[PDB]
Amino acid sequence: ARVRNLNRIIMGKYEIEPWYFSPYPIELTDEDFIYIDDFTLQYFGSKKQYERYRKKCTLRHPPGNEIYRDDYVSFFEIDGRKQRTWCRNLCLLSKLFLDHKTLYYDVDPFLFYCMTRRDELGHHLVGYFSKEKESADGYNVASILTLPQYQRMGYGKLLIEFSYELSKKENKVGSPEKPLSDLGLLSYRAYWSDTLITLLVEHQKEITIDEISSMTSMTTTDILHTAKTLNILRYYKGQHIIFLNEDILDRYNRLKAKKRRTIDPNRLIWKPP
Template identity: 75%
Template sequence: MTSPGPAVQQPANDESDQVVDGVGTGDGSSTIAANGGTAAIRPGAASSAVAAASAAASVSPPPTSIATLTQLRVGCHVWVHKDGETRLAELLSIVPRKGQPTFYVHYQEFNKRLDEWIKPDRLDLSQPVQWPRPEKPKKGPPGAVSKDTPLSKDRKNRRVRPSKHNKAHPAVKGKENLPKEDKEEDIAVKEETATREDSIDATPDLSQVSEAPAANKDADLMDLDQTHPQMIDSQDDSLFSREEEIKKLRTSGSMTQNVAEVARVRNFMLIQFGKHEIEPWYFSPYPIELTEEDCLHICEFCLSYFGTIKQFQRHRVKCTLQHPPGNEIYRDASVSFFEIDGRRQHTWCRNLCLISKLFLDHKTLYYDVDPFLFYCMTVKDELGHHLIGYFSKEKESADQYNVACILTLPQYQRHGYGRLLIAFSYELSKKEGKLGSPEKPLSDLGLMSYRAYWSDTLTELLIDCYPETRDITIDELATRTSMTTQDILHTLQTLNMLKYYKGQHIICLTNSVIEHNELMKKKRRRRIDPSKLLWKPPVFTPAQLRFAW
């Protein structure tokens, strides 16, 4: 099996080269090696070098003391009773609810999804509380103007407008032609901004990894459920360590695009959706008056939301909807799919986006639903069609994305429904005769699900259709699967199946890949039957593709 095209090589990870070799004092008088190297100190700067070294070494731990409930403040670390044990947690917010303070905590070394609102009785105040370190005032050079003075603001405004001197000397860029005071002030502002951004979210983020080039940083995110580390060659074990990936997903949350303080604090402790009670993961912009309630009640058919159980029960008596308000385009023995136009069903689709925002931290769309189609997967019983999950796609995508947002509700996760949603999105792409890929960047769980699907789909096609696929090319694989060539190449590289042999790249099926394919065949999985898909690609006018501003 051959694949024409340029050589595909995986570059080495550049992060290992980014090491800080030394720390300067700021005035150019001395240089001290920070990684065990030698220090070259000028004779006249010995005292300043010793002072800098002692200051760097004397990083004191945060102060601790026994505290009362009224003394607690945002930023301190307290011990909290959780699942029969005490865990160290950081207080992110303190809000009075119904006459008593309620604390929003983030458990140290645990995923952001486990952040929760707790009541005072769960705090263990018999153990010392770690207080946040006070911020040290930044010392500027003698005669420097404070950043809060009108003169400083005037300098910032003046710096934005290019001067004639800058136009006359285009080779001089940035801060090269600024006065010395402005340079130092600009550096101080940048340092303060970086410190403030670091303090906004103490949980590491995977968005920097997933937005990086696929061959470099995406390789650090392997699927923990379906992808098999034994497929990776021994020389890449350091890059695809299963233990490290578990630690990454355990200590980091989904990608955040809203850095506002309110967006990192979950506003509901519990939601009731049908017969399930679910703990939300993230913030969702529901009406603020509902956040005072202990539980948010959501109708599982029309997705309307209520603050009290009495209001919800009165609504259920009147609600007659028993399935998503769209066309049923697929039905088999287990699931059904409905297509809903966001332009025709404004309220229902907006409510659906509000629900998904509770479990997708990176999701930003929850109001303008007109240019999107929603495909909802349901299971049916005597009461009606119950929502399992959904994915949305743009009516006209300039980047050929076949999925804009995808979610399986938590009560149905780890049952194979997420894989079914992904497979259905590619079946629609096959009907359209296009190649498709999910919109980037993906969340951490979305990236895991897609990589598992890509791996299993390609290995199954190559093995089951052999020897027909003996001389298959990358373009032919893309045509058969509707996957983009970039996704295919990345998956083959991840599975170590792309080899360079006699001047060309070949796809090599290793023993571990074959064994894993046989193991997956033994598992009974739900599959999409293309013959039961009754759907034609919709055609829209330019007016139907616009946002409803």
């Protein structure tokens, strides 16, 4: 009698191996897989069951409002209490790639921003980030995930950038909830670095902290830590600023050569609470 652990999930054409344990309310059996519908995120212990439900009429994108949509990606705003089942299913899936996450069942306190790539085949959920409706610490991101099959493609950077666009529209500075996983922190540092580097070449050669905070919603702390790592912290005309140098132009051109996608602030049609 084999009592196996969840060693792989079937999502679309991908067979994915979990990084961490997730509290799926499933029976332990001699099999080590479950099916995860790439639309409803619902889980099944048998291909047959998955099949039965695949046939039923359902939307082909996240159950939320599409508040951002460009030729590359779309962002859907989902309210936990308004879509408990779907969101609980999203947290269960997310917990497979996070060392720690709050009780997946309690989704009412969060707002979920899900990102999709649109193909001739429709919407494909590639990542998302959650956010506390009310955060005592002003965190603008609770948990953030790029589905593993789509990692290392720039989507995570898009997710972080979008989270900052909400904060800008909200007229508040924000920072991701601490502590961060090594993966998340390295993604954030790359993002903070690319942002200051782009601001210094496309906006102004010298920028004060307030100006950077105003244009990016980044916190003083994250701005200063980033400016120090790049060695661009200086004092000019009475206040601390970040300045442009040769290394920056170089890094910028390299970044640009990578021809990456970004978030167009003008395409965010959204009003904060």
